[PDB]
Amino acid sequence: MIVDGDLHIHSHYSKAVSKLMTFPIIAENAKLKGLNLVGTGDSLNPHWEKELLKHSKPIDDGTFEVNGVKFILTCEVEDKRRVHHLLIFPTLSQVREFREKVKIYSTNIESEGRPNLNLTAEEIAEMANELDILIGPAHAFTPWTSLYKEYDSLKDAYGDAKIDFLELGLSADSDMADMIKAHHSIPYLSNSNAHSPNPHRLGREFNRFEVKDVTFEEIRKAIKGVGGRKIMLNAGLDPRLGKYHLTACSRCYTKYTLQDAVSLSWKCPKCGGIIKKGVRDRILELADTSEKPKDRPPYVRLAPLAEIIAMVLGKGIESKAVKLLWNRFLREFGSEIRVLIDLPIESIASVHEGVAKAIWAYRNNKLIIVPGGGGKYGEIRIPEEILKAKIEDLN
DNA sequence: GTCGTTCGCTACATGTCGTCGGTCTGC
DNA sequence: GCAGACCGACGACTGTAGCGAACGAC
Ligand SMILES: [Cl-]
Ligand SMILES: [Cl-]
Ligand SMILES: [Mg+2]
Ligand SMILES: [Zn+2]
Ligand SMILES: [Zn+2]
Ligand SMILES: [Zn+2]
């Protein structure tokens, strides 16, 4: 069976997240969005484990189900050097063992959903490998709390330890990450880092797995690519839409080149703020080869359907009009990805004509995109002639 | 034209832990 | 004067109450 899974979300116990991020709401929104699998997130926090055991029913010792949505145990932790890492746990026994194993290196493990571990990246990865916990650098290029902002290579961070994936992040896709030769041996994950269950947040990126059943072991085989199981697709936000795609200032969000950045010594002149290096420039720094492996699954860049609806209707992303149109699209059809990539534009025009024209413009790459940087998301705008012209003469 | 509804935007939170300036201090 | 301790503020890790103001079904 073919399932869409999002293995990186944060519960309401984490910081800077929404209080609505609870198991029932998450399951409802993932079901309405067409998301078959969602990682639990914050699994090290015992209160979130209690909420999971309450609001879910066991599929096996490591997979749970709530409101028809399956859930595997995932978590994100912060390094002694402020480097975020993602962990997938086989069973709840492994969750509890790893939790008790790191209580002597953390002070907020029972307090926050995203804990701070006073442990080296190598140490955390070794503790995960010993317990068969899958570990990988989460949002591995962001300039604030990533691996490649602190270290220059995966070996420099993990040393003799082993990692089982690399979360690409919003501002990256599989090709630019494959610009680093080591990554050719590593499976990619494209997750959402969801802090809100809203349309454009939960499942903004996901992984399309081929599995026999939706259980942790099947997902693990698919990530490793064994026994027929495989990650057959990597869907994600277009790299330009990300918060840190280009180098820009952290205060005024003015885009600077890498040359101008090193010239200004990372000081925004007309702002007085810290300018942070974009993930594109970082990858170009760490560039290794112009080649990339063939077994790599494709990466379908997508813009959130709610964002396209808000840009066509000329209204805010949270408005009731865009929410109503989004719900009508998700009722008439299956999922956001289907409406964005697979569905023919004539079928989209039955629900809304302007949205269909914008989706055609996004498919044909005739949609203006101002890239994001420094912490500001990229923006999508449509030309006038795309909206004022009919659909027949469009292509 | 009424007057509930919806919109867009600004301000603020909520704890740990870096970073990055400015300040004390002990020489 | 100066090295170096010390220190406070500031933002990532983003979401949303809540507040004038426009809207839009009577
Ligand atoms: Cl570095
Ligand atoms: Cl194996
Ligand atoms: Mg992406
Ligand atoms: Zn993170
Ligand atoms: Zn996260
Ligand atoms: Zn600036």
Establish whether the CB of A272 is closer than 7 Å to any nucleic acid atom in strand B: no
Exposure class string for A367-393: b at 16+ Cβ within 10 A, else e? bebebbbbbbbbebebeeebeeeeeee
- Which of A's residues 143-172 have CB atoms within 7 A of nucleic strand C? 144-146
How many angstroms from the chain centroid is the CA of residue A274? 25
Closest among A12, A70, A78 to A37, alpha carbons compared: A70
Alpha helices in chain A (DSSP H): 23-33, 46-55, 92-101, 121-130, 147-150, 154-158, 174-178, 216-224, 258-264, 279-285, 305-312, 320-332, 336-337, 345-349, 353-363, 384-388
Rounded-to-integer distance, Cα A170 and Cα A146, Å = 13
Q: For residue A167, what is the domain's CATH number?
A: 3.20.20.140
Say how many Å lie between the CA of residue A201 and the centre of ligand 3.
Answer: 13
Rounded-to-integer distance, Cα A34 and Cα A17, Å = 22
Closest among A240, A100, A108 to A176, alpha carbons compared: A240
A59 CA → C4 C1’, Å: 59
State the ligand closest to the CA atom of A268: 6
Say how many Å lie between the CA of residue A137 and the centre of ligand 4.
Answer: 9
Q: In angstroms, what is the C-alpha Rg of chain A?
A: 21
Establish whether the CB of A18 is closer than 7 Å to any nucleic acid atom in strand C: yes
State the ligand closest to the CA atom of A273: 6
Say how many Å lie between the CA of residue A238 and the centre of ligand 3.
Answer: 5
Whether residue A201 contacts residue A192, with contact meaning beta carbons closer than 8 Å, is answered with yes
The experimental technique behind this entry is: X-ray
Helix (H, G, I), strand (E, B) or coil at A172: coil
Whether residue A351 contacts residue A328, with contact meaning beta carbons closer than 8 Å, is answered with yes
Closest among A344, A354, A274 to A312, alpha carbons compared: A354
Say how many Å lie between the CA of residue A51 and the centre of ligand 4.
Answer: 22
Return the DSSP state at A91.
S
Establish whether the CB of A142 is closer than 7 Å to any nucleic acid atom in strand C: yes
- Which whole-number Å values give the CA distances from A100 to A44, A138, A257, A345, A385, in the listed order? 9, 23, 46, 53, 61
Closest among A167, A202, A141 to A9, alpha carbons compared: A202
Q: Residue A363 — φ and ψ, nearest 5°?
A: -65, -40
Please give the residue range of the domain that contains residue A134. 2-240
- Percentages helix, strand, coil for chain A (3-state, rounded to 5) are 35, 20, 45
Closest among A109, A62, A64, A116 to A89, alpha carbons compared: A62
Nucleotide nearest to A81 (CA to C1'): B18
Helix (H, G, I), strand (E, B) or coil at A320: helix
Say how many Å lie between the CA of residue A15 and the centre of ligand 5.
Answer: 10
Give this entry's resolution in angstroms.
Answer: 2.9
